[model samples]
Target: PIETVPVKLKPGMDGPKVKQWPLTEEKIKALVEICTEMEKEGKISKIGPENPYNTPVFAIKWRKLVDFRELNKRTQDFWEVQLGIPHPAGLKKKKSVTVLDVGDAYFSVPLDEDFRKYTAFTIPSINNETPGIRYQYNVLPQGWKGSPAIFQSSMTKILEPFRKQNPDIVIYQYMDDLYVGSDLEIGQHRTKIEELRQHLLRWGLTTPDKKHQKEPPFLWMGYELHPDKWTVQPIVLPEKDSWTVNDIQKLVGKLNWASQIYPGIKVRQLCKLLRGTKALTEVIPLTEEAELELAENREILKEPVHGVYYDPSKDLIAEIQKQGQGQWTYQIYQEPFKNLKTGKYARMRGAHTNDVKQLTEAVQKITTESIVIWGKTPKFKLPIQKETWETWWTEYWQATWIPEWEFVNTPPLVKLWYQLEKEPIVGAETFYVDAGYVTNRGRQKVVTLTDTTNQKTELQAIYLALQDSGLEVNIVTDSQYALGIIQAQPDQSESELVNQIIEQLIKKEKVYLAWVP
Candidate 1:
């Protein structure tokens, strides 16, 4: 049975006595002895009646974990807006969650020099008589800086051994509460819970079995976990505006949790409210300014608004960059490929995951010849030209860049369809130029240099045409030999045409030479 104390002092005897005095007197004496020794050892200080600081119990600064789940907009709104403090606040799960708590977590830690004086108080008088024995706490008391963090750290150490057990159990600790989850039967969970209960008792800590609830959606941290959605969401507050200073601080804390998850709310404003009232934990006046802010914050929180929905298919992301301890986020898209062909089919292009059977079927119908389906379609720019096809197809089998790099939209196959439909059979100036030989039956003629004249080399001709058009062009070729011969001389490479070819390349605007087929 747990001990209790009356609300007020009785008329006779000492001002008050522990309700079940004998049960705790032994432990109290034991605690006093330990503190007395520690004080002598200079581990903790003792405060006399003359001690200086007059710190109130409420003024002690304690530790509270920054809820990491509320770091990002996704998670912020998740708990506040989405979960909205469901009727049965907790995560719905297949297995039961056992929540264990430490009844006096703060008392477990010892007091430091800076804090020892603050715990001083006079003992109550006996039988309404003058009784004046001023004593100070040698151990940590509630509402002290670092106490909560210390308690949590201690719990972590005590629970460390449990982590080493087989068939790993999931344990979550925040302040005094410890939650354990497992993919095991209720009996199995109970067995482990019983084991932990014993360990806590041995450590001089208490764990009432009633606190070990087998409820679904076991609430542990600030947010509730929904077992069905495999989601974790915020706990929403009830509607109301009139608040005490403490209420304002709690509300701001809740808003802060929501700010990280819910993108819909204005975070800066809510944070302003928190700062305005000095409301993280300490109670200050909830002035008119804070009250107005609270109303606005509450209105935004009234409806659960989610951050951007993740589209698994269309939104391609290379990396996720989180800020504010992973509260805010930025998605990085993969850089597109520079090479026209390889870029589309390469694994990084995000092709395998895409559905392309229809694209392949369409391409097969257009190409006519047996088309072995390749990777993602190579990217190219449009207004698909009327004269580029015969030439484009002529070099199709070999390279990625037919021309200089191009970006794409829609499916790669769809782009090919657009290209095929627009391509015309014939055009003036032979709109598409050739690099190698002219395929005119028995007499094969090298396009640039013939038996007669050392005219422009095929590469030089493409460069001049590019200069004339004031637009870049791909010097497409069926033969790798032509490509090699045209650009071979890296050294004195200065034939008249080669010089012009090098000059055009130096201009960085002339032409691209590629072997397609």
Candidate 2:
């Protein structure tokens, strides 16, 4: 879930960046044609307040992520080639063995019927009389959740015949950015590109302008691939070792994308620190130890290699795990020891001593990188990580086997009671008993009717809220009578009101009914 509190940024820092605008006339025409075609094909429908369904829109970030990943995977084969960007993009470049590009890639894909409603998108009203006009898309619309993936898949299928026709031509494509290579002379390469372009044209797809001696190199997947060196590098690098927490995170995120290309450059440890860090002021210095290591790794990344490789001391990892009893315990308690308020479910261990910190740090440092192969997420969890405002207290490294100080067999009821007590009311609406409704400053909603007959309205409203808002809600009630009716076995004995409630619950996406005091 996203945080309700706005995160603070340093002075002069800005929010997330937005994509460039100034859509070209060509692009605008293409988009207009796309909408017209989709509407004509019954791929999209008109939307107004009259529309019944509330469809959620997706973000451009989704397309960006999918495109980047596809670009990496599709172009993996060209990692060794001398790569460069072409200038006057429509033409070919010098030593450019091949050239290929695509247009209207995403626009050509048909939106799946199931996802059509989600493409209910808003566009600026040209007339200015009616503002914020909306249209539901039938064909795949750009920036929708499945647009890039589907378009990529379809384009790949469409290009298969060409791929088979010219198995010798190196072809790489992501969305619309395309690359091609040939060992043959420039003439053969141009001929092959022309053939490919003609093939695309036949399929009613657009291809990039095709030619050239000394065309400047362009960007792909955010990296600049130099033709002279047959190498690629990140467009942005950390200017200095000292940096902000956000800067560190951004750099690490970028590096992860190129982890395979830049092997031996480990950031798992740095990432861990980033994960743990909170708050800010003076720029936290990247420890000299890490700076030195990154320096060597960066040198190595400058040279091409077979693939990613990692070497860590296996013996050391095993010994440390042995010492840790193979179970890494997390904090689950209130801090200051005194905050072990009665009935709380804190299984928190006190901070590990600096002596033990050294050991835990060493073990994690050794094993963190090698534990994953290909692409895998690291394991991380917080166990009541902090108890008080004071974060300096040691709580993670205490001895686990000290039976004398340990508390065991905390009852389940104790934990549940603690949680409910902490937040008696969760959200808004009603808390009711038969004809007796209870309200607590909008904490939660419960309905109480004067009589069980009054329950029909209460239950119907809850069902309607779920249907309309499409939000997941846990309905809290005071009576076991209502609860037992809802929970009872399916039988003719069930009353019509209970049956109606159950049916509504079933139809709604995530309606839950729970009994509480």
Candidate 3:
């Protein structure tokens, strides 16, 4: 069972900040060849040995999540009462499917348990925060120790609806956090944040508390999650807190860690952020081994996995050689809360609070330097995100409506109309538009695209729409699709495609069937 909506990549949607287009099967093949040749030439390079260039993951760790159990009473209460997941996705009508490990083999399950939770579904908890809050849908938690398969399944479940809504939505999830969107908007892509958050809420999960919730300035899988923010200032003798080389290395590593997911989004800005550190001297680019060690240590830099793999060393900060060689410092620090007699709370004494300006500067630098690291998706863009209605109106009239009208009259686009004319009916994919900005009148205008056809006329039409937006397309008429081999057996193809189609329908449900109402 899944507690949160799994973010999905829409089909045909471009990567968020991906400068280079996604590797088609052919493109992927070309990349494979180039990489293989590079390896032979000894010129191949990567962030680290563990993260090999173009090594298709035997299994991508934490990039996705899958269901482990149903959302139980406790989870339901948690969602409805605590975080408020309006509803669970796909609670009925027998659609879900998943894999089970039954020793010595793997098998697929279309079981009731897998598809629909028994009305009596529930889970247990203690400490009385919301004790005995019974409900159904028992699913696994994100940080459960060594519980990879369960989380993977949960994530898989969440991803369905998102994919159905948009065929192209590029993303990679790390447990509860998401590093999504593209490099082009890395510096400013709050719309993605809202869109993704809404999906998560619909799935019955809330974001972590704001303290833990970062803007795109966060890191995911050894990459910059957003554009960085940094600035420098003059300092006094008392402010000369010399930083250790290790500290600079750690911070530089942090910047590198920001943009690993969308490899297409290069971060020249990150190099600049490394320069304005209050620490004397600069943080330079790291060597391969050093970068790997840094990524391993920073959990944010690692790919997500359902099963828990905790490296205790991550919590341990080593005693690096200080600038003053003989000196030693504690890697971890703790201060006590004392009364006024003990000069209570250093901040009150103007000792700590005095650094507010410096702290502000530090934050500025971090935000300016953070780079976007998710997929650079380029499909449909909505104008609703603009700060002003004027911008949206301008975009609609000038960029979209006007351009589309031109296409309708232009013979070049007449080819599209003619191609679809062969089909009985036509419908455009549901796309993100300036809904918030658009009046109902505008919305109606936005959705008026359709071609007339009756049921009988469509029988011979080639036009088809997949149940899930991101779903790879397949058609009975086209023999050469997802399945590689052409003429295996019609009956087998029917059987496989039928089950797969059912899966596709379930995908539609997963995206639309919400617990909300």
Candidate 4:
């Protein structure tokens, strides 16, 4: 069903066609030469983690989810090299995820004064003018013209084998972008990379070189990518100085094409940049030269809010001093000991019918259920040390109930087990409970609690899923919702992503929001 829609011309004219990126023999040959040279010099050589068990979840980024069944070296290496997480990419690590639907997160793409009015999906008229992309089955437009559309058709075809392997793999792909993660050991990372490289090579694309990452930095969206975990460079083209309108067009086309993957970014940023805005509200200006050396620049921060201006008298330093006002210790005094969004296991209990009006109201007191398993090893561990027996015990309890999070590899429970982690876990399986309530407002939506041990019953399946996977949601003086957090975002965009979390949570018949400050 996800095929390219043919754009043919009038009646028998045989041509309502537009020009595009034709990967001619020359280009393919040049690319192959690049790959060959990379192979020869070891620059393009694959470099996942030493082992797969230590791999990161992002390892799945390189391969299909079904293929990532075992917490092997290939997957782990991809995580370490691509995602840049410190440890291996197995689910052994405990991760607490919180979801907030910051009302402000919703934003739609806006076109330029000149371009917005264009009726047809025509280029030049649409290019640089309409900042947002339309990522339909075949029509994926981004910074680079053909990138998204090309990848959409190509990658899906490549991953078809893995997807067909199981229904789980097919479902893992929420639309075109699939997010699969698990904890890992070092060896698992290596195996994932090897498998991924072999698979991708079979698909006719090359992973970007780790050393020469700046130019056309590879992205999983595109078959091109790098194998090194240290290769966290932006997906940019190398020849920016020589970047012509065609080059910019390519970037836009690609970015727009893959917009579905990264989500909620640059509807305004890209438009404003293409328009060459001089203000900070929008505009991501960087020199061609700056893009080149950024690879080795450790100081370069990822996306927005880069380069700290160290002023000792500034508020940031003062805030740290204020926090130091007392001994360096802090405690949360408020205890029903409740963290509704992300406590140890305080999930909303009971299932609310898909009644549109009743579901949205807050304070709708309803019973909820959560799992609070006692740690296998006695005593509470503070600041939870990594690889400690206490951590294992807590996992044993969490995994006891949420077995889907606990994946099995070779050697049974003795070794190679994995799981997914997002937020920091200050507490343990201290207690697991799921509770819910009807809001004071005419209830707009109802929350449901189900055992996660079975992936069969996911939040998404029952009417609506959690807002989004976030550590901190956006907060404002008078806001109705909070935003979710994410560890890694594809490309440098988030426009649709901003509202995606909230939109996905809204069931047609049920409401999912309430009053604010």
Candidate 5:
């Protein structure tokens, strides 16, 4: 009964028939061969000439893809319960690990007969020898948003019983990828894998021959998992000087995945280069800073970090600080901490907003077993009010067994803390002026202007400070009236000169206006 599911559409909804795109002769031949094989395997079938819904189809490499964008938009949404994949940290105590891949993952599940007509797609006529034919998928098709959830629901039903039967082995499933690990001996691990294979076979699913790996240094979810440590697989970058946004994005994706293990992989520069560009093909010059960032990341990925095995006896210390641009970076260490002077850890960076929610999440990722001695109270205020923050924290603590956590001042031993150099802020020139005169004391420059009304003269001094050079400036004046005019709405002021000063303030960056009594 769980082998197939029906696709439900919204009430009174019908998709428009979208015509197929043009294909070359070679592609058409390849697609026809694929469709014939699928038909023989009972995955698809030919339908009659008349169907209310039809979607386009295209061929890429050796695969046939049906475009269900129009149909998917009108389909009703469904909620499916799913199991969470265990973190790589959970594998720290395991003696053996096996990685398994499911063959033809989505195609094994079939769609209901009544819902098959909604997936009809047209195949264009090839010359005068063959006539156009329409076909519909009997099995679940690719590229639908709901396909993954539905497939996962069925897989959970099949695996849940097996999990309860064998509590000695731990099984983690992320869609089709599975990792089975146990603390028992190698012989026991192999037996468990064989047992799982037989169970999946009964459900009409098969694991490919070469895809099942049982060894110490196995690759699972992009990280090479060993009995003692884990590291990311090395990725090669482009050798040329110029790079497209597409290339940088691909590198960022890999670095993000690697960042799970190697926290030093910084994506700040790569993210900056991607800014202001919408298209993937847009070219961005490879600046020296960007090249250096990539080189540093490459060096960091070359080594494996220690596995995250919790030691209940060791004291856990955590330090969180808000860096420039409100990005919070934290470090966690166990007792007999290495490099206490620099506060370095096996994993050492987290780029997130300065909020309690993200802070708790970051700490949760590192360790949850021991009492955490948090160094230096976080002085930065939260975005929420203090009362609201207290309420939220109380609610979160009440829901779970809150670990023994304490906040204290910086310990004396860790005297020298390592801090990344912040991006330099451009120094701005400051000028102190009154009614009819302006002077920058440091530069020893004085300018005398024609006498005018007190308000107009103060405005002129500000205009002169900004007009001569394009450098950002700080203007100081004792006239409160002039400041009030600038602060008022544009419609409230009648003077054109006052409006011009307001425009300058709006357009420029780092222009500070101060009034001192």
Candidate 6:
């Protein structure tokens, strides 16, 4: 007999009986259909008396989902639960992969009778034929916090012997979904899958016969993984006119996952659009630029980028570029293995206050035998100094510098910076000023203050220039002290004035701060 694990509640914690949400007729029909099916399969049963712990159930996408929030709050943490899912990056060089689907994964695991009462819920009356009743799950139900961990633990116990016996084949189990990969031939692959199927069946867990997928290119966990390249499964976008915050959130989340494979897919515009709305259900009107970006993303998903697989034998190139004042873009490439062919690259953008943090985070994702650094910056000579880079190499990457791995300086690209510099705001003005005890703008007295230091005077001048204007204003000051305070870092002594200036800077992108002398 299979050993069942009971849901362990916190000591002396008795959860309240939460009432169910009122459902529409459509939702009621879906709930009844699902509950009836579960009843027929012996997954759930009607209870004789009312229970102390009653959770709620609701319908999502025409399927029953239990609201176990209160129960989860009262349940003790299962510390033995393994949190890591099988990452796709591990399957890089495998010759073939097979995905298996477990039928009624959660339902297969029988819940202990002691804890079944805690999972009880009320089923609303449908009609005279099916009266109102309370049903509790006999098996593990959906939307419970402990279900996944418990199910995974059970599967792990069952598969322990099989894993040890078949050492060559890698089995990745994520709850109901299992991915098996091996360098074995097609015939051997089939043999292994069949053996696994038999093993699962022996343990009383059902792997549906029709759902067994053998593939060179298979869809696993929203990504289409092939021998050569892996791409995300195409997303179904909502209609542009009827876009809601929820839809935008889903799109952003999907794109974020896709970004792990293709870092060039920019979701900044979509993210910015999402910030305007507070609630997920709130409707968001798509801007013209946002629509254009969505179309561009859709087009890019159609084509696959090359060189996603990280080859440990080849040298890896880490290319870092400063895109703007604080924006940094980094790309990792597996040095071209074949002659006359370029390698694949993964690029991502980040904002950091200093170059060290930016460079550290950029290369943290990279995995290769040797690293070759190629760097570019518009304002600075390099992303980080050679001495600082060497220190980080040993401290962070934990590798000493070798002859094969060296930094190559590439001249900064000025095209985008130059274009931005040349673009003129229609109704903008420029001001040149100087400050000591008295602050002057364009030979006119702006502010004369007492009991203030020279630094405060200079900052006050620049602060006045930035305020109360919708028009873009370029403020030029000759105070190096003031410019250093604004550009490099904030001073603790003059924090209030500096903070005010910084807030104004962030609030108005039109206001520009520059030093003349």
Winning model by TM-score: 6
Candidate-wise lDDT, in order: 0.40, 0.41, 0.27, 0.25, 0.61, 0.62
Alpha carbon deviation, residue 392, candidate 4 (Å): 48
Query: Which residue runs does candidate 3 get wrong by more than 4 Å?
Result: 1-137, 141-146, 183-189, 208-212, 216-517
Candidate number with greatest lDDT: 6
Write one digit per residue (lDDT tens) for candidate 4, span 1-517: 2233232222333211222223334443444444344346432233222211111111111221111122121111111112222111101111111111111100111112221111112111123443211111112222212223334444556667755653331112222333322223335533443444456555333443324222222333333222222122245434333434344445555544322222222222222334544433432444544343333221222332111111222211000000110111111111231111111111222221111111111111111111111111111112212233234445432231111111213121121122224332332111111122222222223445465332222212221223321232221111212211211111111334323433433322222222234
Please, what are the lDDT tens digits per residue for candidate 3 over residues 1-517?
2343322223333212111222334443344454444345332222222211121111121131223222221122111112212110001111111111121101111112331222121112233363211121222322222223444345456666775664334444443344444333432334444565567556454554334554533332222222322111111111123434455554554433332221111223323345545654543455455444344434432333111111222221111111111111111101121100000011121111112222222222222221111111111111122222233334222232211000112111101000001121223233112201121122212222244333211211211233324332222322223212211101112233333433443343221110111
Candidate 5, residues 1-517, lDDT tens digits: the string is 3566667788898754777787776777878888888889887898886786688888875788888888788777877435443444433357777767877767877776777888888777778687667788787778765678878778778889999998888777777777787877878777888899879888777885534454657565565667655555555555667788998889888877665455557777777799888789989986678888888887876665544543434444555443323244444444343211111112222321113444444445434321222322222211233343344455442352223354434321111011111232247666776633344545433566565675677787776665643446666678797655543212112466665665565455555666789
Q: Please give the distance, in angstroms, between residue 341's alpha carbon in candidate 5 and its true position after superposition.
A: 18
Candidate 2 vs 5: which has more lDDT? 5
* Ten contiguous residues minimizing lDDT sum, candidate 3: 338-347
- Model 5 bad stretches (over 4 Å): 1-3, 21-32, 61-63, 78-87, 90-92, 124-131, 210-222, 232-304, 310-329, 333-517
Where does candidate 2 stray beyond 4 Å? 1-99, 110-138, 211-219, 222-278, 284-517
Clashes of 4: 134
lDDT of 5: 0.61
Clashes of 5: 0
Task: Give the Cα-based TM-score of candidate 5 against the true structure.
Answer: 0.56
RMSD of each: 21.0, 24.4, 32.8, 26.7, 11.9, 11.2
| TM-score, per-candidate, Cα-based | 0.34, 0.35, 0.20, 0.21, 0.56, 0.58
Residue 175's C-alpha lDDT in candidate 1? 61
- lDDT, candidate 2, equals 0.41
Between prediction 1 and prediction 3, the one with superior TM-score is 1
Question: Taking the tens digit of each residue's C-alpha lDDT, what string does model 2 give over 1-517?
Answer: 1111111223443322222233344444445455565678665676775543333222230121112222122211211222333221112123454445566656555655543443344433334374544566555555444455556666677778789887776566645666676555767877777787777777566776653322335444443444332224443465675677777777666655544344345554455446556664336667766576556555765565321111121111121111121122221111221110011111112221121233234334323332322111122222211221012223222332110122223221011000111122245333333322332334323444455555555544444443433333445565665555444312122256545544455554443456667
Q: Candidate 6, residue 22: CA error in Å?
A: 11
